[PDB]
């Protein structure tokens, strides 16, 4: 499952693979009564955030 | 003296959902509310005098 091409710059091509980078952000998290996280909103996306 | 945490109160059974990595329970005072016995792995509770 490794075919060769030259895809880049906002394309879509099967890889069975993902990667992303982290940044310093502040989050507001809620805890359910069971103690399980269910919702979270980051403060630096939109004015509504 | 549960591995530290000097205090006083009443100890009773609880129905918490302490995950295998979860050790200490807190309320909104930064004061302990539930603790797990190191020697038996049981979910206790602390109630003020």
């Amino acid at each position: 499952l490794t075919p060769g091409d030259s895809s880049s710059s906002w394309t879509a091509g099967a890889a069975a693979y993902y990667v992303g980078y982290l940044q310093p952000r502040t989050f507001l998290l809620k805890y359910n009564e069971n103690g399980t996280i269910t919702d979270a909103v980051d403060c630096a996306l939109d004015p509504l955030s | 003296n549960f591995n530290g945490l000097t205090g006083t109160g009443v100890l009773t059974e609880s129905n918490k959902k302490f995950l295998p990595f979860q050790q200490f329970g807190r309320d909104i005072a930064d004061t302990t509310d539930a603790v797990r016995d190191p020697q038996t792995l049981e979910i206790l509770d602390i109630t003020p005098c």
Binding site: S7, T11, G13, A15, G20, P24, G35 | F24, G25, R26
Partner: peptide, 28 residues
């Protein structure tokens, strides 16, 4: 097959090892 897509909402992980319940704690 380098390609670009969207991440949506993913990557929330417990920032601490202390039990909470019905709390709105926020961390940076």
């Amino acid at each position: 097959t380098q390609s670009y897509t969207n991440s949506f909402t993913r990557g929330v992980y417990y920032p601490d090892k202390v039990f909470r319940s019905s709390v709105l704690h926020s961390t940076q």
